[PDB]
């Protein structure tokens, strides 16, 4: 009757088929929550191998076929774009929500009421964070910082090593710090330039007091250390003068080709003159240098760099004080290089890093700069260590932006569903099975913490829950919203006073994504696929 | 025996599905079709799906080249293997003539085939390069063979360098 | 994983192993209790399943489905093995059991992901399961005084509540009038082969009657047939074992003569044999004569000439009831034909039902067997009316075995939740969990009820409760009311021995299929 | 809404459960029930083209190339070739119609799919299945309640066959031997009358035959109140026709006889070998004398017989038919009054039939002879010689005299009758109408659908005698309603009158009672059904 | 009304005739609308978002 061609799904069919792919999107990386978690091996079909913890790269790395699923997937994405960590309890609350959800509408509960209090849910469960759950970190200090690094860093390749990767991430985020507009102080990662080297052991891993470049001197005659290294960044190539289209050459007199010929060259070569007449010692250029020119600038006993990459050159512009030139053209129609465009640095130096070399920039003026080359036994080490080193400088940017940290360890979701079914008693009569189903939703990520631990996930929940009902029953116990999951020893541990924060903002975000991908998914109630 | 104009009416509208569906393998198998006779015949006188989806991708701007095999063809693998460590910008790939399904006159003669894609069509389709090339010659002479014909394309870092828009501001 | 050149299960074996074999195992169970869902209650709808041969079977009956039902699956294969067992023990209850052991599992799903250990489920099953069969065995509604008309009162109600679900609960208070009465006619071990079942095409519901004697198709008549009187207002019935045609004496005899007169002599003895035979026959003063082995033409048209009926080659069971119904013996041989081995009925008469013909022998006094004549538009009509009527038999046949009713529409089910959670409530708290999911999966059987009939499920569950929790017993879902009432005083009656085996076979299946920890399925051989 | 569900698990493991899972389909629910509503009415339109004196025929060809022109509805529907299973239901449906009443078969299929139909825009309006067939069952209880009311009674006298003869005109009237409709109808109530237990009690078939040859032309049908036979005096030089016959049924061949036991017969000299033949020669004459010694004139055989006993039989001026069929060797004996003997030495006078006339038969140019046996004293036993231009018409006459035989048998059962041509429908329906306008609202609509559904049969016969439906329809219900006269029904053959008692249509209670109730029965279970598992 | 036995041509000027009727039925139910009334506009524009 229909005659459409393709397959079509309605009903309890196609609700549960969703719900069964984003059980099985959760399931996929359930198992990499919490220190306990252990890390996966993706493997392509090239035999490329991916080592990794994160659940956004691994989202990203499959390959996925069901509509749910790729929700799922961009959610995770969307969650480290906008937060950085997160990633994989987001999809574990969104896909518990979506089954919690879906047996609710399967118990004859129409999903907009269901819809209408996942949203209340989820207004409440935000308010309380930001009212009761929140600890300001003003009077923790640096320790504040340190504990959010140590905690981020956990279930990761760098998690035993915490104490010193911690301290190497504060310094790099404060090293890196500025003030714009309006005095507010502002954090900029990925300004911090992660370099892999595989080799000795990861606690060699050293952080540059200025900035390192994957690029080596153009030629073998420059010297490979400048002690007040005048730096000039170009970005213009400095190879043999060519015209443009339009610019032709036609020879009529013979006599000219030998001075055009002279010419064509002495161009690059008096810009290069100039440039070097005010002193400069360092030449960094975006672009390409030719035999001629490196000669040059060896015989000045300077050095040159050719191919530098843009953000790289912007970064050591900006730290140094010098000002990228894309070319030398001045106000009044002439070729000229001032001084003034020249940055500064206090030592440029070629390193040998594990039988190949890179340039460290050292303690450039009037501007910090960081960076981090990391050390590990193989290339898939190197990279999981760069990956869970993002995720810990975005943590402490998150928590040094908004001040505001919450005790982790699933306290925060065990207090939330606590509050939350104490309070669908007060509003709505089928609405408040939704916020009921919302709360014990919200205890997936403990649950799921005590079975990565091995422990007795039951027991320890319900110690927990009982635990937290009586901090919000008795007001005179408010010390115990801080009781959070000690996966170590398995018991229940005040984590605030043991050091185990992470940013409101990653509970904030998650929550709220996690709820828009289930309203989403859960409007669904009928399938057209048509055929290719 | 009459009625020459049937005028079959609403019968291939009615039916239009199971129409349609043929007409999709069809032309499914026909892509398939299209992409083998370009080989056959064409030169031959003077899964399948991933060979399809394969050449139908990528950039029309970049070189790849397919070899057609069966299990001398371990040394022309050799080659192959040291263009590709010699050519990493190129994506060598090679696949069975039985996965394709090829004429049996192209297994029984044309074994070591240099098939050539530049943006979908065939700018180069060596086939039994065995008389024109020899048996043992190494990856430098096959290099140098190709590029005489103007067909294949013209420092090393620590290990990687590669990771908001934010790149650094330190304006007050 | 290593490939191990050396291997050590056949190849090709496959192994799951776990928690997430263990999730698979469940579903699957919730997939198999899905196929049967919407067949449970009156307002329950048939499944229509075809199979290679094309053949179509048309059933209400869980049993029916789930065995029609194509199973591979090892855990799934469970459910159709209980409620094979419910049907064989109790016959009806075979859609609520699968629904319950589903609901069970489906309960105790979240605790298994997250890592309790099956045993303890087991142990909570066991215990809820003896606790919910302790109360259904106190609180069940008997009555001690023997009085007839109250105990008919009681078959007739249980076999209309066991018959109001399918396609003839529009007449089901005459079909259960019928069933009760049929029941009542079997003797001390109430075999179901003793209640013939008949299906004749054509004809309503309401022309389906039940006879008091036994009925047959007629059975290849002879020639000479039609001339034989087809009504008899006294006969005596001679039940045989007999072929009644001239034949060879014996497979292996062999007749050996050299004269002509021995060749006449021989001719003449045979005849003379079959002649004796069916002299001896007439002389034995019966009127109608029914055999195993085929009646000749000869024998037909000798029997027509005395004005007798005769009818060969009649089915072992058929002449087994007429025995039992008459009160005759069967007899392999006729030399020794005594009035006590002849029976009698008072009228026996051929008449044509929907394009066929049956001998009816009617009047008998002390018969100790039925025979039920159905009649519909269509085969599997009838054949659907007989599984309901088998139905609706075993349920009167336990009903007299042990007169212990509940009542029915999911009051029986709210009282042990209630009494479970009540339990539960006062105990350490690892255990009462898991018997508060037993007490909560208790309630499908209403849910289901109100969904299938359309309701709310959730405001019926929740007045249920309510009702339940401060007093009342027998208070379940009222079907044509839209609301709750006393199942009790609406005579939705039960024998609590259904629900003692579908809550025991239930609670069986899902301890066995969490007890289930790793599934291994070796390659098939002679795949052919 | 196709393949079952297809999950392969939550973690990535097979998940199989029912086998061949994937090469298996499966419906739920509302799609399910206008599937099958849309079948049903698919069926019921085709048939319902073939209602009433102006239906059209179908041309049903077989597998094998053999081509039936038909106008019965149970005929149709079963050779008809069909795969769904709401069809083959609907089949079976006209075939329970055929066996239980004989006609109507067509009425039920028609009424069905109009049930089915309405019970569709009822489903549309959210009312449960169940209920409509609830109401669909209250409304068949209503309308057979007033189809009993509105009933009336005729004589099934002998003495007087008039409404007999009515009635059979009635049943024939739609079938293509309306040309000849009196004289078949009297054929057909003669037929019955003739053989029938007469308290009442069954008629039964088996000792109607109805046998067909080609040739002549339909008005040649005629009843033989005896037995025709196919078969022939055996030897050519026997007389073709015999006067006063005093029949001899025999069921012995005219052999030496022959023991059942395995037997050897030793010949051991020259003297055992004359004494065999002999023994032999005197076998044949004994038997021929044996029969001769009876008085009777002709003899008749089962088993055939050899040479000597032929020419013998032909030498004793006794005529001889051999190799008569059992089915016709009762049938001769009932007619003829005389008993079946198993030997001859068994055979006397008091055995013998009698037959008025036995004559040979033929058939133009053709060389194909049969033997008629009449003029019997009380033969209890007719057959039925129906002659035609084609064998498809001679089919067709057959099974129209099945159906008038059929509706005469049941007027023999019960006497009640209601007067057709949709007058009956059309009361019933305005009685449902009535009733529904005090039950409920609920079950109003149900009733209201039972109701229009009914009214369909009418609308029908208008539309194939090209007369408007809904126009004729209406005017016949409001002059119903005005004059109290359940017998105003549509005036299919423009006869200038609507009042089908005057028209003499004449249709069986019993026929319009098991309609209405195998039609409820059947929609009520295509209603019940919301699964289908077809591989 | 096709299987009744009516021409495809009289129902389509009868449903002619009852859409000028609902026309001016739906016109006589309607009520006078001024954009400068900020409470209506906001109510068009909840109803038309609530199904989404
Ligand atoms: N030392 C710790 N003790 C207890 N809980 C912790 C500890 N470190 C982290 N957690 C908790 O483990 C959970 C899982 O974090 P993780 O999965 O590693 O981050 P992501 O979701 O970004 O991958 C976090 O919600 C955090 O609260
Ligand atoms: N009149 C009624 N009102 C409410 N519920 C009923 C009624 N009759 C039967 N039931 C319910 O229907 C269920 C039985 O459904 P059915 O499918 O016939 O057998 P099974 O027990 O195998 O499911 C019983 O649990 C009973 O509670
Ligand atoms: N002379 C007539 N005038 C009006 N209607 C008639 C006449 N004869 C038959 N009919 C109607 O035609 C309908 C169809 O009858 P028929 O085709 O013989 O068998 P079936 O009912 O199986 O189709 C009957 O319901 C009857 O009422
Ligand atoms: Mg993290
Ligand atoms: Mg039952
Ligand atoms: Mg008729």
Known sequence: ?532 | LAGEGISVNTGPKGVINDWRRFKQLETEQREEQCREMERLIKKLSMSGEGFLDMIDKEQKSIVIMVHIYEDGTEAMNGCMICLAAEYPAVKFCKVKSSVIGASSQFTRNALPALLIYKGGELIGNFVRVTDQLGDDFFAVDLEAFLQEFGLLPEVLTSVRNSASEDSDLEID | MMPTPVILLKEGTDSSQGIPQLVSNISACQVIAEAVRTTLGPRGMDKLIVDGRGKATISNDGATILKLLDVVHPAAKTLVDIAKSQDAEVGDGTTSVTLLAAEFLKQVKPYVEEGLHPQIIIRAFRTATQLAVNKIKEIAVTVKKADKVEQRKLLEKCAMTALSSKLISQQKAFFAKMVVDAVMMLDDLLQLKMIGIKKVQGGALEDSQLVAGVAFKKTFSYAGFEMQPKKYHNPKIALLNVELELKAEKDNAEIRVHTVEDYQAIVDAEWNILYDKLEKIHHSGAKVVLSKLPIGDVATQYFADRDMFCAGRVPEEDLKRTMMACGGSIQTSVNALSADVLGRCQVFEETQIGGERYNFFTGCPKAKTCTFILRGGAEQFMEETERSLHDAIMIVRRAIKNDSVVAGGGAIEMELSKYLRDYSRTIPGKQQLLIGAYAKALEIIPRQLCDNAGFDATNILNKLRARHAQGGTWYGVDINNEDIADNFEAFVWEPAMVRINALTAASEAACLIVSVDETIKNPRSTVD | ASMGTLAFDEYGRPFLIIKDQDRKSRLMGLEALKSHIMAAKAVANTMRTSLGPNGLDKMMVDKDGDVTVTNDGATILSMMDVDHQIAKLMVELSKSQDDEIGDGTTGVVVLAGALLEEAEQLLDRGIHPIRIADGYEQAARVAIEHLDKISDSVLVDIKDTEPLIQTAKTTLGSKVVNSCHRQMAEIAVNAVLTVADMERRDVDFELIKVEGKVGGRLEDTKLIKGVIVDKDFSHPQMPKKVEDAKIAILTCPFEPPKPKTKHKLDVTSVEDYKALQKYEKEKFEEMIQQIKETGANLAICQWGFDDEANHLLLQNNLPAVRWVGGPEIELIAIATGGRIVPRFSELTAEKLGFAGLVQEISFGTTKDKMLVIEQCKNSRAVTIFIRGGNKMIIEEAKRSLHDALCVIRNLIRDNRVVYGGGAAEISCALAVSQEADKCPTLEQYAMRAFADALEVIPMALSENSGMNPIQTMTEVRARQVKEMNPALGIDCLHKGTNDMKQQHVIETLIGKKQQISLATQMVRMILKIDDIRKP | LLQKGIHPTIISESFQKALEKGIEILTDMSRPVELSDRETLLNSATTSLNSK
Request: charged share 25%; proline share 3%; hydrophobic share 40%.
């Open chain 1, 1 to 532: 009757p229909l005659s459409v061609f393709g397959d079509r799904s309605t009903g309890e069919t196609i609700r549960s088929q969703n719900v069964m792919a984003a059980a099985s999107i959760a399931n996929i990386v359930k198992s990499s929550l919490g220190p306990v978690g252990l890390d996966k091996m993706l493997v392509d079909d090239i035999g490329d191998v991916t080592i990794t913890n994160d659940g956004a790269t691994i989202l990203k790395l499959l390959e996925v076929e069901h509509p749910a699923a790729k929700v799922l997937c961009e959610l995770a994405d969307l969650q480290d774009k906008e937060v950085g960590d997160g990633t994989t309890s987001v999809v574990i609350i969104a896909a518990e929500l979506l089954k919690n959800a879906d047996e609710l509408v399967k118990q004859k509960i129409h999903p907009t009421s269901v819809i209408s209090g996942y949203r209340l849910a989820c207004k409440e469960a935000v308010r309380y964070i930001n009212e009761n759950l929140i600890v300001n970190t003003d009077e923790l200090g640096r320790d504040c910082l340190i504990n959010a690094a140590k905690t981020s860093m956990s279930s990761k390749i760098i998690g035993i090593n915490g104490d010193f990767f911690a301290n190497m991430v504060v310094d790099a985020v404060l090293a890196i710090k500025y003030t714009d507009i309006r005095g507010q102080p502002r954090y900029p990662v990925n300004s911090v330039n992660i370099l892999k080297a595989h080799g000795r052991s990861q606690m060699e891993s050293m952080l540059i007091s200025g900035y390192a470049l994957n690029c080596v001197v153009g030629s073998q005659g420059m010297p490979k250390r400048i002690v007040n290294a005048k730096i000039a960044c170009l970005d213009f190539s400095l190879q043999k003068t060519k015209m443009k289209l339009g610019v032709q050459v036609v020879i009529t007199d013979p006599e000219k080709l030998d001075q055009i010929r002279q010419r064509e060259s002495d161009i690059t070569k008096e810009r290069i003159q100039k440039i070097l007449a005010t002193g400069a010692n360092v030449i960094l250029t975006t672009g390409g240098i030719d035999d001629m020119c490196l000669k040059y600038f060896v015989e000045a006993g300077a050095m040159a760099v050719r191919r530098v990459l843009k953000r790289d050159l912007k970064r050591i512009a900006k730290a140094s004080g010098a000002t990228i030139l894309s070319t030398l053209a001045n106000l009044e129609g002439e070729e000229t290089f001032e001084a003034a465009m020249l940055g500064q640095a206090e030592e440029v130096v070629q390193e040998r890093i594990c039988d190949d070399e890179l340039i460290l920039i050292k303690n450039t003026k009037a501007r910090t700069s960081a960076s981090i080359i990391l050390r590990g036994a193989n290339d898939f080490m190197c990279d999981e260590m760069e990956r869970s080193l993002h995720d810990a400088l975005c943590v402490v940017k998150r928590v040094l932006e908004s001040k505001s940290v919450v005790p982790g360890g699933g306290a925060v979701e065990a207090a939330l569903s606590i509050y939350l079914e104490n309070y669908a008693t007060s509003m709505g009569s089928r609405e408040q099975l939704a916020i009921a189903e919302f709360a014990r939703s919200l205890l997936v990520i403990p649950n799921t913490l005590a079975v990565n631990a091995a422990q007795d996930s039951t027991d320890l929940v319900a110690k927990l829950r009982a635990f937290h009902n009586e901090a919000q029953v008795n007001p005179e116990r408010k010390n115990l919203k801080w009781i959070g999951l000690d996966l170590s020893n398995g018991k229940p541990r005040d984590n605030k006073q043991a050091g185990v924060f992470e940013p409101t903002i990653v509970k904030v975000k998650s929550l709220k994504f996690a709820t828009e991908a289930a309203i989403t998914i859960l409007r669904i109630d009928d399938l057209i696929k048509l055929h290719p």
